[PDB]
Amino acid sequence: GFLEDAKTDLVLRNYYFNRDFLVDEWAQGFILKFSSGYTPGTVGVGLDAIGLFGVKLNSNSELLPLHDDGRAADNYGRVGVAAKLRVSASELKIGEMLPDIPLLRYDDGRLLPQTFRGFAVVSRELPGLALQAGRFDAVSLRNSADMQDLSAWSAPTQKSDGFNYAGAEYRFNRERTQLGLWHGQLEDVYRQSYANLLHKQRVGDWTLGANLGLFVDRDDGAARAGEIDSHTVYGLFSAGIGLHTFYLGLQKVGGDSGWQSVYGSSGRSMGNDMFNGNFTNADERSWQVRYDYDFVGLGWPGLIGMVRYGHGSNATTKAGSGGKEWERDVELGYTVQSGPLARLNVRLNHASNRRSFNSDFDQTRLVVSYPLSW
Ligand SMILES: COc1cc(C(=O)[O-])ccc1O
Ligand SMILES: COc1cc(C(=O)[O-])ccc1O
């Protein structure tokens, strides 16, 4: 039922951000999600809403929008609604939403999430197979209260009438393997095709995983961001045992151009994605090593750590070719497991970025999040 199965989730997010090239930002966010149930019947009808509000505290960062003078706003926010309609094992949503698909990953790396306006269909009528398609015609950046036309990261000022997509994922092999094929079009800017293989296999105490991906990009229509021809391949491999996980990522961009994506979106579909980049400059070859540990092994349940290092070379940028870069990320995340503060999450992380072709910097973040649900 519409009211029966309705859930309300509120996240309080206190976010401290520092980048030393020392510049600083501190802010408080509120993210309110109201998700109804569905009316009973052949066509079920529902409504989702999202409320976003951020407040500047005394002190990228992209935590808050900037005034024209370059001064961060005191506060910002917006409210979005989406209607939902369900039939059998298929759903259509229309309005404002948070798309999380391989060709369009909504960003939530700062204070409030990026949202999009459009429609999205997910259909699971045949066992193991999920079909998706949709179109988004406006976007609100993570650091903006407003909606604007979409554009590509490679030319953020060149606007498009919208982003269309369709894709399929098939999961099989006792749920261990998944294949994905996706096609997207940012109208008059670029078209992108993507294939993905996910696989996991247990060898004794080890869990071995692979995430292989291939993107192929070209300009579309009027080609407002210029001519584009790119392909990007990555393989991200994991080996887990007990409380430990090890990763090796390998990636290469080829062709005339870098890898394409929608401006403001997250780079997290890419194998070597890290906090401050994903090594997708034209021609760039990169590798990554990563280690994760679950500190329950030291009597600290709820504490998890990650360290990762990535290096890229052969990078072509406007300035020149043969560019090199590296990033090192470290994170400790703690989630309170029990007591009055249960579910409270504290994440502390640090990134160091060095680039032969751009500015070097270190970055420190502390994010304290508390979820309430009723
Ligand atoms: C628009 O409101 C919502 C959107 C979403 C989303 O798209 O995932 C989730 C919960 C919401 O309350
Ligand atoms: C000269 O600047 C850099 C060089 C390298 C390298 O040689 O691996 C890496 C990152 C850099 O920022």
Side-chain angles (χ1 to χ4, degrees), residues 311 324-326 354-356 360:
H311 186 273
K324 302 180 177 189
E325 62 175 329
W326 63 259
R354 308 294 184 259
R355 298 179 163 134
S356 72
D360 297 354

XYZ file of all heavy atoms in Angstrom, residues 311 324-326 354-356 360, ligand 2:
90
model
N 48.834 4.880 -10.610
C 49.783 5.636 -11.413
C 49.381 5.608 -12.871
O 49.032 4.554 -13.399
C 51.181 5.031 -11.284
C 52.236 5.836 -11.975
N 52.544 5.671 -13.306
C 53.030 6.836 -11.525
C 53.491 6.529 -13.647
N 53.800 7.248 -12.583
N 52.321 12.291 -16.842
C 52.334 11.248 -15.809
C 51.614 11.747 -14.566
O 51.607 12.949 -14.286
C 53.773 10.867 -15.447
C 54.588 10.378 -16.633
C 56.002 10.003 -16.218
C 56.781 9.446 -17.402
N 58.086 8.866 -16.982
N 51.001 10.839 -13.803
C 50.338 11.253 -12.579
C 50.268 10.096 -11.602
O 50.371 8.933 -12.000
C 48.919 11.773 -12.866
C 47.967 10.718 -13.485
C 46.525 11.225 -13.637
O 46.107 12.052 -12.808
O 45.801 10.799 -14.575
N 50.109 10.411 -10.324
C 49.764 9.369 -9.364
C 48.828 9.892 -8.309
O 48.703 11.112 -8.110
C 50.996 8.680 -8.754
C 51.935 9.517 -7.944
C 53.131 10.032 -8.363
C 51.810 9.872 -6.558
N 53.742 10.709 -7.333
C 52.951 10.629 -6.215
C 50.836 9.646 -5.576
C 53.148 11.152 -4.938
C 51.031 10.165 -4.301
C 52.181 10.914 -3.996
N 49.600 13.907 -7.541
C 50.718 14.543 -8.219
C 50.528 14.340 -9.714
O 50.266 13.222 -10.162
C 52.031 13.905 -7.774
C 52.213 13.858 -6.259
C 52.344 15.253 -5.637
N 52.611 15.155 -4.201
C 51.701 15.323 -3.247
N 50.447 15.638 -3.555
N 52.048 15.195 -1.973
N 50.639 15.420 -10.476
C 50.404 15.382 -11.908
C 51.456 16.218 -12.613
O 51.704 17.358 -12.221
C 49.007 15.919 -12.228
C 47.886 15.092 -11.602
C 46.498 15.640 -11.907
N 45.490 14.615 -11.629
C 44.361 14.814 -10.956
N 44.064 16.017 -10.484
N 43.522 13.798 -10.762
N 52.096 15.660 -13.637
C 53.115 16.417 -14.365
C 52.463 17.540 -15.162
O 53.112 18.529 -15.506
C 53.923 15.502 -15.284
O 53.151 15.087 -16.405
N 49.620 19.938 -8.276
C 49.725 18.928 -7.214
C 48.991 19.376 -5.954
O 48.996 20.562 -5.620
C 51.183 18.661 -6.849
C 51.989 18.096 -7.998
O 51.408 17.793 -9.059
O 53.217 17.954 -7.827
C 56.965 15.134 -12.931
O 55.810 14.958 -12.305
C 55.360 13.654 -12.056
C 56.101 12.559 -12.465
C 55.634 11.279 -12.196
C 56.429 10.085 -12.631
O 57.547 10.248 -13.224
O 56.010 8.982 -12.395
C 54.434 11.088 -11.531
C 53.690 12.184 -11.120
C 54.157 13.462 -11.387
O 53.408 14.625 -10.957
